[PDB]
Amino acid sequence: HHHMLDINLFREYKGGNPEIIRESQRRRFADVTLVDKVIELDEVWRATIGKLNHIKSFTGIISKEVGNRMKNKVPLGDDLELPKEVTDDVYALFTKEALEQGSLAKLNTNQLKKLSTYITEVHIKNSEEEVKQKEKERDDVLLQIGNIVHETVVVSDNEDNNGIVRMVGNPRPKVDPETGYKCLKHIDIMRKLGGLATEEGTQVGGGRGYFLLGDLVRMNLALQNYAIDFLAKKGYMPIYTPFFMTKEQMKKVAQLSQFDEELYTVTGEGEDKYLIATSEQPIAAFHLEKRFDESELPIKYCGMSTCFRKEVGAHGKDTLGIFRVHQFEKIEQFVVTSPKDNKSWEMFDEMIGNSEAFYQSLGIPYRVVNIVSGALNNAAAKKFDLEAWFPGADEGNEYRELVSCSNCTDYQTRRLEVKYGEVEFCHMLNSTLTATSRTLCCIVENYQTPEGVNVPEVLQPYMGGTKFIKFKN
Amino acid sequence: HHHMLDINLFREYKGGNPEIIRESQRRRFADVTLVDKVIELDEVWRATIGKLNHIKSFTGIISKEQLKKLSTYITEVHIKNSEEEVKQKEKERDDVLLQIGNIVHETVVVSDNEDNNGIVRMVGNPRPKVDPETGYKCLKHIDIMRKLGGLATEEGTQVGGGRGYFLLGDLVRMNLALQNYAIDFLAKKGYMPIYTPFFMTKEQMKKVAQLSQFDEELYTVTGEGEDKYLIATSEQPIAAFHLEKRFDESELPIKYCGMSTCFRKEVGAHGKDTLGIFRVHQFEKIEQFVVTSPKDNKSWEMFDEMIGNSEAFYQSLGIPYRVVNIVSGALNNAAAKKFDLEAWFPGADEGNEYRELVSCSNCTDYQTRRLEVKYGQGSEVEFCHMLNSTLTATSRTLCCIVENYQTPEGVNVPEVLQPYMGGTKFIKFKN
Amino acid sequence: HHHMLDINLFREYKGGNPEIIRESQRRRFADVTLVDKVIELDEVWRATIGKLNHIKSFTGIISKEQLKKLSTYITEVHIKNSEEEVKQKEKERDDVLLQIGNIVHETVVVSDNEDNNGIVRMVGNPRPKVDPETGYKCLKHIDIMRKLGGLATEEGTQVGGGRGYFLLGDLVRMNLALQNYAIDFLAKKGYMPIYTPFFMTKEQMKKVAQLSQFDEELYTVTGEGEDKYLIATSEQPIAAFHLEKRFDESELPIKYCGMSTCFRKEVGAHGKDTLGIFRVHQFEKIEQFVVTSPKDNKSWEMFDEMIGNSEAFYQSLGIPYRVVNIVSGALNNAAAKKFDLEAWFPGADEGNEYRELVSCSNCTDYQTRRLEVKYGKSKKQGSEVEFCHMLNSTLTATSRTLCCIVENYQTPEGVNVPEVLQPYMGGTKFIKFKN
Amino acid sequence: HHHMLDINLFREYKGGNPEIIRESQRRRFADVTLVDKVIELDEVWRATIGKLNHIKSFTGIISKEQLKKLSTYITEVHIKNSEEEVKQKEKERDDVLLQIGNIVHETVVVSDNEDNNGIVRMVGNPRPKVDPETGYKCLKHIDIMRKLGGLATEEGTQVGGGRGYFLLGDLVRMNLALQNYAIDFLAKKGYMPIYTPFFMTKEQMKKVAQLSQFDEELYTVTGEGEDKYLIATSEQPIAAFHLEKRFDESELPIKYCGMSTCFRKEVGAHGKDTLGIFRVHQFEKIEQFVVTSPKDNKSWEMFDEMIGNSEAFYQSLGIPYRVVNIVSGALNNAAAKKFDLEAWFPGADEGNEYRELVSCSNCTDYQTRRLEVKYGKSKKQGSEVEFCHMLNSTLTATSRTLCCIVENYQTPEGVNVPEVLQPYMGGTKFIKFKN
Numbered sequence A: 001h002h003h004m005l006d007i008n009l010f011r012e013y014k015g016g017n018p019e020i021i022r023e024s025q026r027r028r029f030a031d032v033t034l035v036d037k038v039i040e041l042d043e044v045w046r047a048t049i050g051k052l053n054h055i056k057s058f059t060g061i062i063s064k065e066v067g068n069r070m071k072n073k074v075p076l077g078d079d080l081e082l083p084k085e086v087t088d089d090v091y092a093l094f095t096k097e098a099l100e101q102g103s104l105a106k107l108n109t110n111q112l113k114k115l116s117t118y119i120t121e122v123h124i125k126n127s128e129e130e131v132k133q134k135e136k137e138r139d140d141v142l143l144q145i146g147n148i149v150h151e152t153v154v155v156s157d158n159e160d161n162n163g164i165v166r167m168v169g170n171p172r173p174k175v176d177p178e179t180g181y182k183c184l185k186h187i188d189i190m191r192k193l194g195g196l197a198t199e200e201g202t203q204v205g206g207g208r209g210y211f212l213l214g215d216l217v218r219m220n221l222a223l224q225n226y227a228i229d230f231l232a233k234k235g236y237m238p239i240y241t242p243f244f245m246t247k248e249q250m251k252k253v254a255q256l257s258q259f260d261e262e263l264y265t266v267t268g269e270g271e272d273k274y275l276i277a278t279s280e281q282p283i284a285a286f287h288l289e290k291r292f293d294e295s296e297l298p299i300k301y302c303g304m305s306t307c308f309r310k311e312v313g314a315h316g317k318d319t320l321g322i323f324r325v326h327q328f329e330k331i332e333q334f335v336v337t338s339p340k341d342n343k344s345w346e347m348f349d350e351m352i353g354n355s356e357a358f359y360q361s362l363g364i365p366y367r368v369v370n371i372v373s374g375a376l377n378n379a380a381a382k383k384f385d386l387e388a389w390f391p392g393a394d395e396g397n398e399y400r401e402l403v404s405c406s407n408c409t410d411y412q413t414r415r416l417e418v419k420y421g422e423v424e425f426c427h428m429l430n431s432t433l434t435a436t437s438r439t440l441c442c443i444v445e446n447y448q449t450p451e452g453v454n455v456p457e458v459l460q461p462y463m464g465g466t467k468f469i470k471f472k473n
Numbered sequence B: 001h002h003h004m005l006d007i008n009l010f011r012e013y014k015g016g017n018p019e020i021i022r023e024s025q026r027r028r029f030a031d032v033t034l035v036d037k038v039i040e041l042d043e044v045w046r047a048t049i050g051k052l053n054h055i056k057s058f059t060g061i062i063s064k065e066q067l068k069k070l071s072t073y074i075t076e077v078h079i080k081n082s083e084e085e086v087k088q089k090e091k092e093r094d095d096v097l098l099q100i101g102n103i104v105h106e107t108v109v110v111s112d113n114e115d116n117n118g119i120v121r122m123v124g125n126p127r128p129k130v131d132p133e134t135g136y137k138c139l140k141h142i143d144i145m146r147k148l149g150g151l152a153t154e155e156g157t158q159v160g161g162g163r164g165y166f167l168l169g170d171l172v173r174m175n176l177a178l179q180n181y182a183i184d185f186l187a188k189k190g191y192m193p194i195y196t197p198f199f200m201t202k203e204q205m206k207k208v209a210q211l212s213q214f215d216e217e218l219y220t221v222t223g224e225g226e227d228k229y230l231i232a233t234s235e236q237p238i239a240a241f242h243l244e245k246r247f248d249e250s251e252l253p254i255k256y257c258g259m260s261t262c263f264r265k266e267v268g269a270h271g272k273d274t275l276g277i278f279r280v281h282q283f284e285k286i287e288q289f290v291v292t293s294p295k296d297n298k299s300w301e302m303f304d305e306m307i308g309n310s311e312a313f314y315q316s317l318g319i320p321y322r323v324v325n326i327v328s329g330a331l332n333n334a335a336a337k338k339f340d341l342e343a344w345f346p347g348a349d350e351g352n353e354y355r356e357l358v359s360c361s362n363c364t365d366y367q368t369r370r371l372e373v374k375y376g377q378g379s380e381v382e383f384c385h386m387l388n389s390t391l392t393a394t395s396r397t398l399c400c401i402v403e404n405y406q407t408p409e410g411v412n413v414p415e416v417l418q419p420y421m422g423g424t425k426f427i428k429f430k431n
Numbered sequence C, D: 001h002h003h004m005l006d007i008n009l010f011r012e013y014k015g016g017n018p019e020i021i022r023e024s025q026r027r028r029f030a031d032v033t034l035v036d037k038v039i040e041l042d043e044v045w046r047a048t049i050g051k052l053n054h055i056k057s058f059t060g061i062i063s064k065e066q067l068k069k070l071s072t073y074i075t076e077v078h079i080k081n082s083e084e085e086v087k088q089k090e091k092e093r094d095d096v097l098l099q100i101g102n103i104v105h106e107t108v109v110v111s112d113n114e115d116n117n118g119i120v121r122m123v124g125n126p127r128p129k130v131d132p133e134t135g136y137k138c139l140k141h142i143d144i145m146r147k148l149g150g151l152a153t154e155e156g157t158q159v160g161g162g163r164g165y166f167l168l169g170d171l172v173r174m175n176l177a178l179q180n181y182a183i184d185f186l187a188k189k190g191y192m193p194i195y196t197p198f199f200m201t202k203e204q205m206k207k208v209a210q211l212s213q214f215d216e217e218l219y220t221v222t223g224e225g226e227d228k229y230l231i232a233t234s235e236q237p238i239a240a241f242h243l244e245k246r247f248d249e250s251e252l253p254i255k256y257c258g259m260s261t262c263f264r265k266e267v268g269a270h271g272k273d274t275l276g277i278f279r280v281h282q283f284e285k286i287e288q289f290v291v292t293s294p295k296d297n298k299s300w301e302m303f304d305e306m307i308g309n310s311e312a313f314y315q316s317l318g319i320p321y322r323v324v325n326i327v328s329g330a331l332n333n334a335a336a337k338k339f340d341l342e343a344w345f346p347g348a349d350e351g352n353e354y355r356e357l358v359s360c361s362n363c364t365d366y367q368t369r370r371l372e373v374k375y376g377k378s379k380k381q382g383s384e385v386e387f388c389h390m391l392n393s394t395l396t397a398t399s400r401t402l403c404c405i406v407e408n409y410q411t412p413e414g415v416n417v418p419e420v421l422q423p424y425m426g427g428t429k430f431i432k433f434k435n
């Protein structure tokens, strides 16, 4: 059983288990004290409701006394103001001892009706606002705690400890044992094909800018076309998205730190917008405030978009070619599931399995890696990456991520109000199928020859039968 | 013979013909007085150079003869003053010249009203708006796509702002099929596929776009490096790709099959074409882009080839259309001539059935001058010619396809696209 | 001999050695093709000058001898055109050259992974994380500072945004003691104190910062005059202080004790080091900054002297550390070599105990070229003048140093004040936990 | 008795006294009609509540007794509509009330012209501008600092923009001595040192600054998270530190020794004080900041104590000064009273010899209302709770104080170090002119 993060989990008196949240924070190497802060604020909130109900009882105590006086035909008295001693402290009049000793008998009936009005206007309203402030204060701390980390996640703060789950395929050696031919790197291969112009690309579009030319363009399309067919046949609905999102929409699907490191701003028509970093962002927002029955789940989407990333944190990293760029196309798996019966965890296995079958069909060797708990973002309960073999890489850098697959359970569906059926929420998952510029880098390295690049068998029909791309220089 | 716009054409005494430029300005319904301003500024410029040479000769007259202090004074006070003043008049002259539009080709219909666009030819068998044998009236593209379950404008606008959309299901696969087929179609005709940056730096965009496009058309993108613009068409980065390059006759023509998503603010078009994905802020477009020699009407022959390519494309899709000669008053400053292909939309409102799907333009050397795309003379060098033409903008082409291929039960897939969609022949209505 | 990066080094037939530049690019894991692009552009530039001078000969042959209009045409159409083409090719060559990083020093560990940073030496006696006799486990800096009542991250972030903090009470006094002691420490070594603008104009900042720093590191400040940047380190304005100056051998070296608040966006480090004041947007830093002669390996001797100063500083504080040789792939474009001092944090999570407190870099003439800090007031070499060298080294960044002190000097009852800081704290020897 | 500005004071029939508010507006030379506008809006607000409660009676009369749909209609169309109208009128009333300035204290000089600032007292023996025996004329601070070699406005403005400056050498050490001595001085009086964020979010800055400060005074800082403002004084973040807190009598007063760099656009002062570091965009300031009980004139006693602290500070430095009572028309909206300390500048132009070094203000509860700094943890008075009082007073802004020191301690050969600062300067007694 994997827990959802909600306020009840913090409440030891209501069947909750706050130590689970502390343990998740420790595995995230995050602020463990947030758990006790939420508990403290929740208790103050609940105590504040108790005070409000205590003040509200004063209303009934007054009206009952007024009612008894009217039945007994007691004169109302003059239109007197409340004594300063009463309004200095109305609480002192409503103790059991004070009432028995005749606290209200000191006031005529006109004064009792003024007192009730005063209590409503000055004390009940003040307490009602204080209840709202404390509720928001608690909820604001709760929003800072990350999703519960799944028990199968490797507990570590260093991705050197990412668990190697399995290895699939036959990675060609960097140096051919019979001819001594050393595998070239993707950028040299693509330039030797005449298919890549980083010089005009950066002149025209800024850093990391590129033009792709010729057969590499046709292979770029072939990958997209095949990926969409591949997922459509597995029941994933193809969906093409806006590449813009309004800022208020983006704030519902992304972490605030992504805004400075990752997201471009776009201005000039209507509200300022962000360019999307992944079709997962608009496809998530697509579900804003919707409700789904068990009979309507799961919902499977094959998302398609160009993706834009500022890569501010990665200056000086992967600066050669189109492995790490600001602009690339990506085919994405996106699934909404029931929150019941470990279905989202079963869907996680299905989605990483889809990506594995995809790269096996391409003849791309890879390994599946279990991402350490300290590196998960706040939404993910678990993340598997597929790291593919790059036989032209510099020593030690041969396995590089091509795919990430995450189960976010109900972390984002809560923020988007994607309800199931004290509401319950759906679960959401996402997984890369293929980001094509980096997959093209991997293909050209694994399929290179001394004369050019072989086209993977499964892509040949999607390229009009082209079997081979010959070096031009 | 079609004239290029350069400073020599303004100079009647040097073999030029400024009345050609005045007549071109009248056909554009533009500021005709700009021609006389260039002539006046050019004459003042030439006289200023003459005064400088007259001043510089004073140096030589002196040199033959404490007599050096006068000579230095002439250099420091007069020669420098005139040499800088020549630059001021030269930049001033060129600044007016840059405002004059390209010479309008003789075959362009001369008019200020696009109601007078010339209908060059009509090709195909457009289906009637209403089937005479059943009474079934063709639906509009937006209704067709929604009945297919393939279009979500509601979530699209919530997520992406005005005109935002999601496309779903078989329509997505048909969108890709159009792109995949278009690229194959042009690659087989010798057009090199090229995928471009969708960003351009502002200095680069200023070389390939008119200044008004920045306000009406181009989004700004910020956050990494210099502020940039989203491209409105792959023609913009592909043109910039040729910045300061030079080509021989043997290296021409250069033919590109450009591919990109395109982004347009459509500020001038609020309230126009507000239903569906006919006019949007974001769409994919396959573009023909060609650089030619400036000799022997080669660019005009390439113009005919390019509109012919688009015609063959829509014939292969079974899309009826007409070719339209855009009136001189509607040409932008770069274009010497523009043909549009307007396709039949049987679901359109009465009178609105033919709508632009393709524009095809010969800009001769107007943009290559600004980009320094030289042909092959010192400063008397010549420049190449550049042309561009839509092959297909896919969201609007999809609108046209579903209207022309609709039935009461769904949408037939055009025959030529079926292999590009895994063999799908028909898309059934879901609601 | 360590080479400076200039155009002459690219010209193999004219005494240069471009393979040295190619090997530096490989060690940086950077774009090697830039070297050949500069060579090609320089050759076209030199050929364009050759064509221009040959056209200029037409004047002497013709003008010495009514074909006089031809001479004007040749000047107006060909000579002017060639002159403009030379200026364009020179700028094109120089723009690519500016993209190549400084020549990496031969003693730098060659690697793309900082796991291979060379451990040069270790100094001190690091206390165990767990007391061997009592089992008391060293607390982390943030918990210590909160138990002292001296750190308010809650009000800090509400008032100042992410990573914002207030410091209160004796922790403030210790923060100040670090700054005052550091400034005295460097003054005794001949480093002149200098207080700088914390704003810099874009034109000047562009000469001392690479383009990636504008997105990852530098805040923009607006509202008076032109938009400006907050400094990330006093190294930036102190370097710019030397703009367009020339220094003779007798006027070097120039040693400055830089002091400022420093401002850093830390965009690349979202989610990293989020607890306490180890990594913040705002901190004070006492900085060693030196201008040296370019002769006789003087800047390399100064590099050793500057890391030695920082080492003696942390020895005097009783802070154990190690000196680390930063791998070539991690150096920024300006640095020819960088040593870090990584101090012991006994409260850190397992495996994270040694963390950077100091960086020390020799940038030789990479920045002085851009700032035109020339060597020699004489112009005898014309445009072949040499430039001074510049170095910088942290002495102490005080919020992170404070974190290190409180972890290393903690007891179960509070924090001992390091002996050398006690006179700077009115004799306070100990700060007691309040909760 | 000094009144707080709250809605009850506007209600003449309910124990208030609106003429007191009108007279405060007249003394401020501000908009008197705001008082009657608040009165009118409050009356309409109270009448709207009366109509709403009367409509609510329809439920009890009707609902107690198939005309049941009428009750729903009355609730859906009239009661909800009246409830919204009450909230709107309350906000409309409160928005006008926020525009009225704090009640001006009775001891404030009533005038619109600061020429009438009251001279409260003068302390010290100001040296003559011209030496009576030698005729030596006192130099101005900028010339002194340049002759010491300690001030670089040329590099300062090139690097940092207008008014930018570097300080070098012993002037830096004296700048630092002022800060360290000031912090020790206030610590002995029980003021806790506090170091603050120099950034503030817009939501918090709006609670401690009036709208005109955003255009004239506050820089905007952008690039990480939301746009923020640079602080103009540590008073701003230290006030915000108390957001939504409640303090009992036993927890007051709260005394802070604020320290920060301060940033000011000085847009209103272009062309004013353009020579040297008397008026700059960036300076360090040691600040007295106090929260007091609202009872028994305690904040007015604290005001006297705070100006007294500043006076003893400048007496210890041997700086002659005068205390000035700032005219009512010049007070900002928050201040009920403001005293300035104006020090003697013997190098100033004729007539400009006394210039502000210190401002000391009692803001009573003007800001604590906006920050919800409540008095008493008990809620026995509900929404009729009282707020604490807040005061602030400069101890020393060091660049301007340095200007005053060098003019007052100059000789023909250099500058004497004030006796009390000598231990803070390693015993340096004198700084000699270098040129």
Ligand SMILES: Nc1ncnc2c1ncn2[C@@H]1O[C@H](COP(=O)(O)O)[C@@H](O)[C@H]1O
Pocket (backbone or CB within 6 Å): A278, A309, A311, A322, A323, A324, A325, A326, A327, A328, A330, A401, A402, A403, A404, A432, A435, A437, A438
């Ligand atoms: N800057 C980039 N350039 C190219 N491909 C990228 C980039 N960032 C991510 N990708 C690809 O997209 C996948 C998903 O990335 P992420 O959403 O960061 O998990 C990666 O595994 C890569 O294949």
Ligand SMILES: Nc1ncnc2c1ncn2[C@@H]1O[C@H](COP(=O)(O)O)[C@@H](O)[C@H]1O
Pocket (backbone or CB within 6 Å): B233, B264, B266, B277, B278, B279, B280, B281, B282, B283, B285, B356, B357, B358, B359, B390, B392, B393, B395, B396
């Ligand atoms: N805002 C738009 N939305 C969709 N398609 C467009 C839009 N603007 C232009 N197009 C398509 O792109 C082609 C070229 O347009 P233009 O570049 O204006 O000549 C048109 O004929 C349309 O097919």
Ligand SMILES: Nc1ncnc2c1ncn2[C@@H]1O[C@H](COP(=O)(O)O)[C@@H](O)[C@H]1O
Pocket (backbone or CB within 6 Å): C233, C264, C266, C277, C278, C279, C280, C281, C282, C283, C285, C356, C357, C358, C359, C394, C397, C399, C400
């Ligand atoms: N964001 C930061 N917060 C606190 N201290 C920092 C930060 N960045 C750098 N430092 C300190 O400043 C020193 C020099 O940093 P750098 O200029 O990056 O080499 C480091 O060794 C740290 O001690």
Ligand SMILES: Nc1ncnc2c1ncn2[C@@H]1O[C@H](COP(=O)(O)O)[C@@H](O)[C@H]1O
Pocket (backbone or CB within 6 Å): D233, D264, D266, D277, D278, D279, D280, D281, D282, D283, D285, D356, D357, D358, D359, D394, D397, D399, D400
């Ligand atoms: N622009 C400035 N430059 C230097 N010192 C200043 C500046 N503005 C204010 N000060 C100092 O700070 C004190 C308090 O200023 P204020 O907060 O305006 O009352 C003044 O008395 C001056 O000593």
